[PDB]
Amino acid sequence: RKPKTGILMLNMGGPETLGDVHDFLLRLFLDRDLMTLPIQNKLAPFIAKRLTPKIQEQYRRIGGGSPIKIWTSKQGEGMVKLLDELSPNTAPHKYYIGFRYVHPLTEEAIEEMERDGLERAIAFTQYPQYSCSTTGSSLNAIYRYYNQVGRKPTMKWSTIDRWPTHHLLIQCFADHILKELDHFPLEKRSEVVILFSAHSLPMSVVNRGDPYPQEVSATVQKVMERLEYCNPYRLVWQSKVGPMPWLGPQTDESIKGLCERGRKNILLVPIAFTSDHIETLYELDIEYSQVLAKECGVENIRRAESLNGNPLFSKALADLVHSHIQSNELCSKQLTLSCPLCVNPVCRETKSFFTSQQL
Amino acid sequence: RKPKTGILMLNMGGPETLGDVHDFLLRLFLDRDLMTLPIQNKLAPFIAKRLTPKIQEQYRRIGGGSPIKIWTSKQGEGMVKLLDELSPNTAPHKYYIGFRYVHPLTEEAIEEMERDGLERAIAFTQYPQYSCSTTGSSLNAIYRYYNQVGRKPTMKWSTIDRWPTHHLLIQCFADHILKELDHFPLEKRSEVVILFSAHSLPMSVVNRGDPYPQEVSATVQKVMERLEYCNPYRLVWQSKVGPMPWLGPQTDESIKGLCERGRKNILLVPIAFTSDHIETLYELDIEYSQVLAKECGVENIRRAESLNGNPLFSKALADLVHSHIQSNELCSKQLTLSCPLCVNPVCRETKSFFTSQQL
Ligand SMILES: CCCC1=Nc2nc(CNc3ccc(Cl)cc3)nn2C(=O)C1
Ligand SMILES: CCCC1=Nc2nc(CNc3ccc(Cl)cc3)nn2C(=O)C1
Ligand code: FES
Ligand code: FES
């Protein structure tokens, strides 16, 4: 039977092999929604070639590439198997992967969805918490695609544009935290500090009204509420690059600071990610948990397992799509409000693209 | 009958009359927990005398002084009346007001509680969301009082040090938002943007790991959950002072930004305050809603009523104390973890003061 409903899973993506690193970095630094550097179409290629060896070396240290596509695929397969049973009037369902910076690109996925002749298309961001830098840029690419080709879509579009507090997402995080708490020495379990580590944002993005920090904070609160506040916690921020101000405190300085103040039993939680990638496998697990932690005299530092192949996460994705379909929603209420200090004209056009869709 | 249980309600306070402004500013700029300044003991009286006319004029604009003491007293009386019936084994209950920067000062309240011979003393911060600059500095003052006086307490101490998601606090905000939504023209109700406006913090405090922004975000999420996401919202930050970086976006810039982008129907919500004071009556209601809003061409800008005399809020306070008593908690789990980049040694001493209390 031909596919009736397409679920486009949106992520920035990462290079699968060392050979993919250069083009990954090229697309990243060309992303005007992320950064407006001068002589962009010529300054970004210089940055890409200069940083490729360093970034190749990071991926070599975690096994040669990013696992994002593998995990996204497994999660999508499970989502589809459930949806075909959950929602037979919109079946058969097909998942598509739309990466921002590597193949398959969002634009290639849209071409395939259209070639498949879908009736309905769901832009399903894989970022639970919305940032203009993540979900916003992915959604812009969908709007831009139809604007560049100059023709209108042959499928009815809608988006699941955020889901920071979905009860099954929360249950997954709480399950992985408890599982990891069990791996500390029993005499130190109560002593463990839970560091929720989310990707940071430049302060210039925070200060123009990006909803990401507040939504990440809501995920943290719902998790800790499900855990009945069993351990103390803090929300800290990782992966800052460059010389500009970013939202802190930084994860690495917070680890170092806890250690120097007698808190040497630490549980890291990647609260803004749904699978492993360079920011967990390299930044948290190598740079912080092995190098920094040893330098500071950590007793035990562990990290909750990424959601990856947990079947409850696939259930969460299918439940989100099912509710989205039954409610006839085109987007969240939050998407109808663009950032108060937004300077990009595309954001309003992308918003209107989804709110005006024929049902 | 002799009072048995004292509830010390902690707030920064504000000057009741124009004559109180100078000493209010003096204590404010002498507070090393709130800000560090060179030669503070001679610099602060310079700043205090310089700023007194300006600040007296702000208070003149809202009727001659701060209403905080009035509202705190009404809230405390209602709390006590309920507690005497909720918890007769700890009755009679008596509330005490402990202001940081005006009379009655935290130190004066502690003296009175001790003189009254209470069996039990509860440090009940009136900030639902914890910052080291608000609740932390108030709790430090309790520890420092016993440290300076050289004696030990004659009453058993505990603290309710935060409550950002208490279900009755959330209901009060939701009720006031709905009531104010009804005062917009019906044809614009759906169009209203809800700006949750919380007092900002300097980035130097945020980057230390202060828990405030995450907890404020959690209050916002629970309110909007109760409101069923009926309107788009943003969390923005007010009351920045000085030239250093603070957490944004600023409330004033956000109002102006919305107006220039076509969102001319705005509901302000003071999400980190429990009553009116200068930041609502002057900054929000005069500086932003009358002057700024008129210059930008707002159609309707309103503000949810502060919780003030709402009897449901008094029920929330009594429910908090009652549950605190039943559970034998000395403090939240979160208080047992100091800021990872905290450089102030009193914070740990204060923490230990409460965790170590005889039950
Ligand atoms: C306005 C452009 C300035 C820039 N904004 C940026 N954001 C990021 C990473 N964003 C991110 C957030 C959450 C998650 Cl889950 C993953 C990724 N990198 N970056 C830059 O290099 C320049
Ligand atoms: C002219 C005064 C200089 C300063 N004023 C400051 N205010 C604060 C945060 N206060 C705060 C109040 C209420 C709430 Cl709900 C939350 C937070 N920090 N701070 C400084 O460091 C210096
Ligand atoms: S920047 Fe957030 S909407 Fe354009
Ligand atoms: S600064 Fe937060 S504990 Fe001292």
Min distance A137 CA to chain B CA atoms (Å): 19
* From B166, B176, B199, B277, the catalytic residue: B166
**How was it solved?**
X-ray
- Whether B32 and B39 have beta carbons less than 8 Å apart is answered as no
Nearest residue to A193 via CA among A236, A155, A225: A236
Q: How far is CA A203 from CA A106, A212, B232, B236, in A?
A: 27, 12, 23, 14
- Contact between B249 and A342 using a beta-carbon 8 Å cutoff: no
Q: Give phi and psi for B324, each to the nearest 5.
A: -55, -40
* Atom in ligand 1 nearest the alpha carbon of residue A35: 2
Chain B (262-291) residues lying within 8 Å, Cβ to Cβ, of chain A: 263
Contacts of A209 in chain B (CB under 8 A): 234, 236, 249, 254, 257
| B11 vs B134: CA distance, rounded Å | 8
Q: Give phi and psi for A297, each to the nearest 5.
A: 75, 40
Contacts of B230 in chain A (CB under 8 A): 333
- Whether B131 and B164 have beta carbons less than 8 Å apart is answered as no
A244 three-class SS? coil
The residue among B207, B271, B329 with the most chain A CBs within 10 A of its CB, best to mutate, is: B207
Q: Which of B162, B347, B350 to mutate to test the pocket of ligand 4 (most atoms within 8 A of CB)?
A: B347
Which member of B229, B247, B338 has the closest CB to residue A333? B229
Residue ranges lining ligand 2, Cβ < 6 Å: B 34-35, 127, 131, 133-134, 199, 201-202, 241-242, 272-273
| Ligand 3 neighbourhood includes A344 CB (under 6 angstroms) | yes
| B68 vs A327: CA distance, rounded Å | 45
Chain A (143-182) residues lying within 8 Å, Cβ to Cβ, of chain B: 164-165
| A136 vs A347: CA distance, rounded Å | 7
Residue ranges in chain A assigned as alpha helix (H): 21-29, 40-61, 68-86, 106-115, 137-149, 167-181, 203-206, 212-226, 251-260, 278, 293-295, 311-326, 346-355
> In the structure, how many helices (H) and strands (E) does chain B have?
13, 8
Nearest residue to B144 via CA among B98, B102, B103: B98
Q: Is B323 on the interface with A (CB under 8 A)?
A: no
Q: Extract the tokens encoding A263.
A: 């808190």
Q: Give phi and psi for A195, each to the nearest 5.
A: -100, 105
Question: Is B166 tagged catalytic?
Answer: yes
A297 burial (CB, 10 Å; 0-12 / 13-18 / 19+) is: exposed
Task: Report the separation in Å between the CA atom of A243 and the middle of ligand 2, taken as the mean of its atom positions.
Answer: 27
Question: Is B277 tagged catalytic?
Answer: no
- Whether A22 and A44 have beta carbons less than 8 Å apart is answered as no
Q: Extract the tokens encoding B7.
A: 């509830």
Q: Which residues of B14-34 are buried (b: 16+ CB within 10 A; e: fewer)?
A: bbbebebbbebbbbbbbbebb
Bridge partners (DSSP) listed for residue A193: A266
Q: Which residues of B113-130 are buried (b: 16+ CB within 10 A; e: fewer)?
A: bbeeebebbbbbbbbbbb
Task: Report the separation in Å between the CA atom of B31 and the middle of ligand 2, taken as the mean of its atom positions.
Answer: 11
Contacts of A167 in chain B (CB under 8 A): none
Task: Report the separation in Å between the CA atom of B345 and the middle of ligand 4, taken as the mean of its atom positions.
Answer: 8
